[PDB]
Design a binder for this molecule. Structure first.
Ligand code: NAD
Ligand code: NAD
Ligand code: CL
Ligand code: FE
Ligand code: FE
Lengths: 382, 382
């Protein structure tokens, strides 16, 4: 079959890309905006960075900083609520995947009221109308939610993180600039960073993978690999690189899927509020082994673009170098090696496994996985 | 400053991507389409490939096959005309850069009546409204007009081919499938193909160049370089590869510019009806030389991805390998080596040089060029 690609029809890159917002707004005559964000972000004067420009440019805006890490259906509802009573024309998502994924949720439902519940929006959410125009402004080195046609919400009730995929999510314009992301504490940079790396690697070997997708992913890996460290260390230049690499990774996996690393990470989110960045970080290497054999020459390239001199290695050799380069990075970035460090409980392995087994992302894994295979993984990752 | 990226918000790739058309139209309830095309394409049962699917899907369509190679203002007017009298909800561009560039022209003017002239639309076209939704379906290994924000028109009167640039031009969906391109005779595959390679190389070294754009271009070069030959010799899989590479190149140069090769080729089109592809083809290597020194390590990369073992080479060495790899391909592909072979006159070089000096593309050249410098070029290319 043919492959479909869904990208931002417009996107801005580099320190100060946020400056281009006011004009994008004008250029397309929007009247009022609902800013969807964190309270942490508003307090740290990050949102101000945008509202201030909007103010000077005389642009109307209202805020909703109700989002919390791992956005729940109640948050999404509260937002839709705030949205419906603002004369808001569009929305601006300032923040990581949470406020951004929340924002996409709000945009879709506000036009597909049909799906007010928000369960009914999992998988390929059967929407008939494109979401309210949304401007994405990421503040983290990961998610790439600014380009992906997907959002994940948490159903606290059913302690399970569910993924929603719909080409109707996609922002009209994405503003990617490290200036908005400089605030990230080291731990946060590392976490989001590795999430992006995870995104890149899982998309390079996902099942839908093909020419364009592979090209994008491998490049993203390359970028991420050679900068996450310096960024976590503070090098602002490396931060700008990260900002790009995470975005590139999104251009790919969004249009092609991921794998178990994400499938085995979501349940971990829903179960212990384990930061996605950290979850993937911990699994990734292990899941990579579990996948090694079903990835042809892939890992060779992965190992290469990560500094490993894969020259003269055997495919098996390379496959270990790759998995190892990863382990190496997490350690060098401060991510705990085991799930036991992040409070995962063995008595839950069975539950999680099932949660993962079902999770939408899993299907994209190059190597089918059985409940037991996964159980095995969670353990050997504990 | 920041870099802005403008891509297709939606694109389909692969043999049969045209199949996804009917649905797209539906998933976004349009009503009627004006097919902008050739007669050659019509007679060759190529447009049928689309009209047939639309008919079966019960989609209304009207055709306009008045386009000709290197489309003139009169053609663009005649089209706008036919369009303004059809009940045309949106338009579908089936064909190379001509029917596609014609189509974008028609789409823009039909919403920015302000420029019914078509000179008043050169450079950064000051349009205030986005063009009529246009679905691009390329039939050639080049142009990439389906993703670039620019169309070029011919002012037969003031015989000079002028480039028009405007983010409003951009098609809503692009359908890239080698099935539409299989008809290209070898000389055509060759010509359009090298045009694509030309785009990739020029965009890789154009002044606006940066991270994302460098990545895209270098990948495109890689793809094109490794398939054009096979495609021209008949390999359908090589054809599918080309289809992608040319599109990829578009993703880059559209958003960053080109250089002299295109600036020196346009006047050649306007003057002698020289196929854009063959013109670029002939110049390219020469212009590359004139540029070598102002392209850092760029050529080294170019040479590599073209099969050149740039291993123990000096930057000078590599730079020559690159320019050579090109000469090598043109030959292998059947493109005449001198402008004299394509009827270029030596009495006119001064005219052309001026024409090129004024061409919008030129300014992107990494090395400033003077009228005389260009004259030098046209001569050493004759
Ligand atoms: N389905 C998928 O493929 C996929 C992929 C990636 C992420 N996700 C989802 O994305 C979310 C992860 O988002 P996230 O990692 O950005 O975190 P987040 O936004 O959920 O939380 C980040 C925390 O860091 C703070 N923060 C955010 N940006 C900051 C900045 N620039 N400076 C200082 N502090 C900042 C916030 O205030 C917040 O407390 C999860 O909900 C996850 O499930 C899904
Ligand atoms: N601004 C830019 O960057 C840029 C880049 C490339 C070209 N251009 C312009 O675009 C045009 C280039 O168009 P083009 O060379 O792709 O082709 P075209 O459509 O202009 O003309 C192609 C000719 O080849 C025939 N043809 C096209 N597809 C065919 C197929 N599948 N099978 C058999 N015959 C086929 C057509 O019938 C026509 O006669 C030129 O007018 C050029 O000036 C601009
Ligand atoms: Cl108000
Ligand atoms: Fe993730
Ligand atoms: Fe061209």
């Amino acid at each position: 079959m043919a492959n479909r690609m869904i990208l931002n029809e417009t996107a801005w890159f580099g320190r100060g890309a946020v400056g281009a917002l006011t004009d994008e707004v004008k250029r397309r005559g929007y009247q009022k905006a609902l800013i969807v964000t964190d309270k942490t972000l508003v307090q740290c004067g990050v949102v101000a960075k945008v509202t201030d420009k909007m103010d000077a440019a005389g642009l109307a805006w209202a805020i909703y900083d109700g989002v919390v890490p791992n956005p729940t259906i109640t948050v999404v509802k509260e937002g839709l609520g705030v949205f419906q009573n603002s004369g808001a024309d569009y929305l601006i998502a300032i923040g990581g995947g949470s406020p951004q994924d929340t924002c996409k949720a709000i945009g879709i439902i506000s036009n597909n009221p049909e799906f007010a519940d928000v369960r009914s929006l999992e998988g390929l959410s059967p929407t008939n109308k494109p979401s309210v125009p949304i401007l994405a402004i990421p503040t983290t080195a990961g998610t790439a939610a600014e380009v992906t046609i997907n959002y994940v919400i948490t159903d606290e009730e059913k302690r399970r993180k569910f993924v929603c995929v719909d080409p109707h999510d996609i922002p009209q314009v994405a503003f990617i600039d490290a200036d908005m992301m400089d605030g990230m504490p080291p731990a946060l940079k590392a976490a989001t960073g590795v999430d992006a790396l995870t995104h890149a690697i899982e998309g390079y070997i996902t099942r839908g993978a093909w020419a364009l997708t592979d090209a994008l992913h491998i490049k993203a890996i390359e970028i991420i690999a050679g900068a996450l460290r310096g960024s976590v260390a503070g090098d602002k230049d490396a931060g700008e690189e990260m900002a790009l690499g995470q975005y590139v990774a999104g251009m790919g996996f969004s249009n092609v899927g991921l794998g178990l690393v994400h499938g085995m990470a979501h349940p971990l989110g829903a179960f212990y509020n384990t930061p996605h960045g950290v979850a993937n970080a911990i699994l990734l290497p292990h899941v990579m082994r579990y996948n090694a054999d079903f990835t042809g020459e892939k890992y060779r390239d992965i190992a290469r673009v990560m500094g490993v001199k894969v020259e003269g290695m055997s495919l098996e050799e390379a496959r270990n170098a790759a998995v190892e380069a990863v382990f190496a990075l997490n350690r060098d970035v401060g991510i705990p090696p085991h799930l036991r460090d992040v409070g995962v409980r063995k008595e839950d392995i069975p539950a999680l496994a099932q949660a993962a087994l079902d999770d939408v992302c899993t299907g994209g894994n190059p190597r089918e996985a059985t409940l037991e295979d996964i159980v095995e993984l969670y353990h050997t990752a504990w």
